Design a protein around this ligand. Sequence first.
Ligand code: B12
Ligand SMILES: CC(C)(C)C(=O)SCCNC(=O)CCNC(=O)[C@H](O)C(C)(C)COP(=O)(O)OP(=O)(O)OC[C@H]1O[C@@H](n2cnc3c(N)ncnc32)[C@H](O)[C@@H]1OP(=O)(O)O
Ligand SMILES: Nc1nc2c(ncn2[C@@H]2O[C@H](COP(=O)(O)OP(=O)(O)O)[C@@H](O)[C@H]2O)c(=O)[nH]1
Ligand SMILES: C[C@H]1O[C@@H](n2cnc3c(N)ncnc32)[C@H](O)[C@@H]1O
Ligand SMILES: [Mg+2]
Ligand SMILES: [Mg+2]
Lengths: 233, 157, 1063
Amino acid sequence: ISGYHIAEAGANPISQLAFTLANGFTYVEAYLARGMHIDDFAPNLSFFFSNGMDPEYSVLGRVARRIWAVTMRDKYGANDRSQKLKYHIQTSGRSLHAQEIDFNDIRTTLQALIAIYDNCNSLHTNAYDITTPTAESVRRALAIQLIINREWGVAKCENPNQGSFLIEELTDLVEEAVLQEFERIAERGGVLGAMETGYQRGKIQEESLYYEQLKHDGTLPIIGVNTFRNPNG
Amino acid sequence: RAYHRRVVAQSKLARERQQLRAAHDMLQGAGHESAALETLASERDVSLGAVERKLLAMWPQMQQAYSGDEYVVKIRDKEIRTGLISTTLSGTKIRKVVLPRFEDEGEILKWLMRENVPGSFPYTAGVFAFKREGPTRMFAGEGDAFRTNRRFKLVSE
Amino acid sequence: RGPANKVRFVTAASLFDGHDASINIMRRILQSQGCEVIHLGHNRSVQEVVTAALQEDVQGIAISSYQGGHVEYFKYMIDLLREHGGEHIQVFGGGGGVIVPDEIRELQAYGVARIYSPEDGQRMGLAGMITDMAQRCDIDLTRYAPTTLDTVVAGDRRALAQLITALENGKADPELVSALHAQAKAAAVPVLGITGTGGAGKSSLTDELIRRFRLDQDDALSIAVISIDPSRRKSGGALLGDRIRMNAINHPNIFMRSLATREAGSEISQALPDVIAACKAARFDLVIVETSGIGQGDAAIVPHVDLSLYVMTPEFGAASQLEKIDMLDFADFVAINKFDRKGAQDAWRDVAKQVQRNREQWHSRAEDMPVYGTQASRFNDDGVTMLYQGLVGALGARGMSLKPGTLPNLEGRISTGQNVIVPPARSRYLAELADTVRAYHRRVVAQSKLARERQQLRAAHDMLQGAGHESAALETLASERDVSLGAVERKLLAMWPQMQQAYSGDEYVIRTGLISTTLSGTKIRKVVLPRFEDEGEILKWLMRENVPGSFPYTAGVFAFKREGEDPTRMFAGEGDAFRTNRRFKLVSEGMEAKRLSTAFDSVTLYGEDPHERPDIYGKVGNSGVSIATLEDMKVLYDGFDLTNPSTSVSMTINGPAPTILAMFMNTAIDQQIDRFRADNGRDPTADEEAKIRAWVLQNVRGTVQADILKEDQGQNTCIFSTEFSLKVMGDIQEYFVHHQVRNFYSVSISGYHIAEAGANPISQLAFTLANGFTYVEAYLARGMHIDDFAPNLSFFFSNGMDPEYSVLGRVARRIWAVTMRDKYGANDRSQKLKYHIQTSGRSLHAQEIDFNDIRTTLQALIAIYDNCNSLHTNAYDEAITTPTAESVRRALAIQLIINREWGVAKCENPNQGSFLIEELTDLVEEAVLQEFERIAERGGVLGAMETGYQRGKIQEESLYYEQLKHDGTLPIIGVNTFRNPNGDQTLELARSSEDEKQSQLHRLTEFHGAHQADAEAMLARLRQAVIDNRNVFAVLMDAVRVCSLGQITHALFEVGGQYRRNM
Ligand code: B12
Ligand SMILES: CC(C)(C)C(=O)SCCNC(=O)CCNC(=O)[C@H](O)C(C)(C)COP(=O)(O)OP(=O)(O)OC[C@H]1O[C@@H](n2cnc3c(N)ncnc32)[C@H](O)[C@@H]1OP(=O)(O)O
Ligand SMILES: Nc1nc2c(ncn2[C@@H]2O[C@H](COP(=O)(O)OP(=O)(O)O)[C@@H](O)[C@H]2O)c(=O)[nH]1
Ligand SMILES: C[C@H]1O[C@@H](n2cnc3c(N)ncnc32)[C@H](O)[C@@H]1O
Ligand SMILES: [Mg+2]
Ligand SMILES: [Mg+2]
């Protein structure tokens, strides 16, 4: 179950997480209605998210894990292996730009950091470059993970997020926001019923436009793009 | 939402249960023996769920586990020891998993139910106990099957 | 086994260079491999290093040059060596990434043996370089030794230096030796021996005495100095550390040779009588011999000299110990040095009476004995002069023609240096502070236990009444704890619900927004409050880590971060004042708040004017802006309203800090004078100008570093003596108080420099806070209200990769706030510690420079998370050059991305709550307190510096780190692991234009010509300000108007002395 494309298309972190978990639960309900046991396909389910600059991304993983674990235990009565949501996080490619490509390593570092902090299962790091994935560009991207995992001091702790007032409050907020979105999809006939109306497509498109607007508006600052621009070009 | 409602209620119970027994021990330290407190306390032992009661019960044993320099856990017939400490150039012991220092059993249970340690339900801080030591997949795909295969063999040499 | 021959080295840092961290860990490996190392320390000209290497007759010279101008420097050295019979001496160098590959091939082609790049260090290893370096210099120098005394007696000092190397190694012909002693006997020159306990001040006193000789006799005396230091027989070589203390030996009439004992026991070289005889035959007017640290029953210097001088400190234990000291029975003079120490007076009366007893001169007064109380550390000490006057009279009777002196022929035996920085009563101030903090935390634990129990009781009381069974017995125990709780603590819990309602809404009623909404529609509160139910935890949190803007200000000294003025403040400085003024406008472009940070070139950092000599010329305008006159300073900040409320300038200067500050102040004043003359079309009257001038001083906003305590410990930019700098630094703060300069920071108490030298985060934080508290104790003993100077105290730290850096700021704030409140009883403005954080430069490398942006991002992040007051970000070409135009934008973008784009940053206290952060905060805090106790038991910060405790600990930690960086135990991506399969072009560099150098020279000579009349007069007034002990800075406010930086500095040298290096 992926959500990389959904976010990349323009969906904010809440929409991405909500739609993806919704899609995941859809597969579950689909397989169950084939008369299958929950402990037979749930441990095979893998997830795939995006990490951007938005605050919600910092707690995206932990929210996804809790919503899954609680529902898989209480609602579907599955075992421990099933309650464990494993996911891959890939840094936001949309968040990187063609103007001042050296700045992208800064953004890709910050995104890679909160991924590792939030104990992700798998991480991909984006290159600074538009151009083909040069062997030089891939090393700078690969070094970001190597530096954080090996050099960065805070990373030597495996649960540095836990305890933080900001993290716990954000976790609760995002979680509820996701649940509310579940209810919106549910009153549209489930995920399949919503797709019939193009609800998801519509909402993603709506948010992509809103982002692309504030970006041009100068309201949403992007360093090297709409502010602090290159004095040469 | 139902799960969280339970966390709030069970915390209120665990908190009150502690507050009562705490006051009971303080009265006996002054001389006054009022078992009226104990009745309300034992009343909340039943009010607490089976799962929740065991969570608070294992909390001191949990603290002793993540306290040492290693993490002893016996699977099958053998055991799997894991280091908890990484020491800095300054000589500071950085624990892999840092436990809270709450005194209130209401907060302890609340934390254990909402955000347990990595590798424990609801796996908020991770699905595994500790991170793996040492994974980078080898992606390749272009041209015909022959070229993609050669790249696969070359990278995975 | 070490080298085949007696291999000797001369090690130093280049001119106007403070970087000793590199050269210090090299002389350690050199010494351990069995080499005698004559360490000269930092800031050494070519004429200094070469003269040293020639007199010591070494095989090798090791120089570190991190300031640039290294090409000109090494070329000069190579040239000067060949010109003066030192062609066979090999020269080695290193400067990290500063010396680019092309310049290495150039210099090595010129004559330099080897210059090591950071890549060389990785491939060869630390020991590998020194092995290569030592094996090259493993040559026998006795072949260059003269066979006849013809050259030596004539006056050839180089032939003398080589003859000594022959005599010391015993390769000199027997018939030549006896012929030397024969002429040495007929020479009849006095030989003064100076012996004493270890570290008493034998070298320092020797230097001062020589200075007296020069000033008294107009440098007409030819003096030979033979200093002996003990040799570690384990390695084979030694650390001859006497020459480093000598500042008065830089003169053609002065010769000095450093000898190792070369025996694990004896305090004299086995060939000392030969070496002395060699100097006697070389027609020297006086020979002075310094021994090593001798015991109480040691006196091997007596039979070899004509006069002996025993040096001791007031600390010798009981008065009965003096009866065990053999040297008190032979010494012709006894110098009780360090007379500033406690119990110096009583120490003198014991030694005096003991000498009287040993000589059986009962018919004489005890005060008439040749026992003197000296303070060599003190410039122009009257005690030392008294000792000198005595030595002259003794040497006079022993056949030594000398002119009637020009010095104050005073009377007495004891120094009258009544100056004290920290009174011995307050000696254990750091320990008291440690107790103060620990006491505070003990209270938090107790008050929490009370608040918790109080709640638990009343909770149970309400639950019983809900069931029926009412027991007022509970309430009695509850009301009992209402009184147990303190007044302050009770109000804290009382305001907690009102506090929660405040940070809950969308605004903070002046009204401030609390909410920033994301693209998802999530409300991110600026300050996130805990949701604890336990009042024990609430109070515990309120006392240990309150919200930002509340005691103890752990999460920040201010309620909310500034709206427009970001903490960003980029360091800048290159070329002349004109070019840097462009870079200022580049950095501060697009920002309503102009926050400048000025970097000065190595020449200005050492208070020198730019000059034609290659020593200095090559360094002008490099590594920083070249500022020499007030006119340069004015140009530097042209177009910047310094008196504007949204404009702050941060100048990084230490040694000449008071002089530079006076220039800045005069600049800010002149700006408003020019602004008035334009808005009124007329010059302001004497009264109008007085009002303007006064107003400027009050509202001018900026920061001058000037932390001298860290100069001795870390940066080494101290030019005058440590005591004099502290004196003038106090003058500055007194000036500020008088003129109500309440917006400028008189000192940036730093630790960044200490850290980059090699100190781990704990050491950095501890030393810096210790230095800060030292200034506090110094000012308090000096008669200033704590609330008068504490709000003017600024801090500066480093942020590296280590875990402790994440909580460095919050720890510094709490330790300060608690101590300033409880211990010193200062007000709120004083309890608030404001600091600047700059990302670690040593954490960035020359290999794979693109990786540095990753590290600089992570470091910048935890700085902003921990609510820093000011932040500097390092460029990616950090290891190679001063930030290029393109390089400074990438560094500046790091802050812009985090502050604007990064989501978590929209919260202002994201650290708070974290189990890791709070545990780390507690650990680091206690670790700092323990270090306070270690410094306290060494006599405070000043007492520790006396032993070189800080410098020792820093250099040790620097070695430990470096041993691991090359090792691999400590992974560094792109350096010791994950290397490039290629091994990698030409990067743009920030060097100064030739035209810019000639510009600065022409501007200087033009400035000098302008005030040629008032120059000598003003400088004379300045020295009288020091002599009459008035306010130095007050005169500098006038001095910088007619005098250049160099003129002022050198004028102060005649009256304030020069810094004595401390290894
Ligand atoms: C630490 C440091 C400092 C510390 C110095 C602490 C101390 N007591 O030594 C502090 C913070 C005080 C400092 C201050 C300044 N510094 Co500084 N500093 C650095 C830094 C980060 C590393 C230098 C270092 O000590 N490295 C540790 C050594 C052991 O490693 P290495 O250099 O890679 O060396 C290896 C090999 O080359 C070999 N080698 C090196 N030297 C030698 C010598 C011998 C004899 C041998 C055999 C081998 C050898 O040994 C090592 C093996 O791995 C560099 C940037 C960088 N990362 O390169 C800037 C840097 C050198 N400093 C710089 C400047 C400009 C300054 C200042 C003048 C700034 C100012 N305007 O105020 C000040 C003032 C200095 C003064 N007091 O005069 C610039 C130089 C610019 C230029 N020359 O073009 C640099 C390059 C930073 C920059 N990018 O702007 N500095
Ligand atoms: C190694 C090497 C290279 C050699 C070096 O040493 S490089 C060294 C580089 N050094 C530096 O860059 C040092 C920089 N440090 C500083 O500038 C100095 O230490 C600094 C960092 C200390 C100077 O920083 P500032 O931004 O000017 O700010 P301020 O504290 O002066 O602020 C001045 C008033 O404005 C208000 N205010 C400010 N921020 C507020 C906020 N968030 N909320 C509310 N009000 C706020 C208050 O009224 C303040 O005054 P008061 O409280 O007395 O009423
Ligand atoms: N407090 C104090 N320290 C001094 C005095 N004279 C020298 N020192 C310091 O003592 C240390 C060692 O000095 P040094 O001359 O090398 O002693 P030596 O090893 O016996 O020759 C240095 O830190 C000096 O600054 C003094 O009169 N008072
Ligand atoms: C000592 C530290 O000071 C900084 N530094 C030194 N010189 C400059 C300069 N001209 N511009 C900017 N930063 C500088 C670097 O970050 C270095 O590591
Ligand atoms: Mg000495
Ligand atoms: Mg000595």
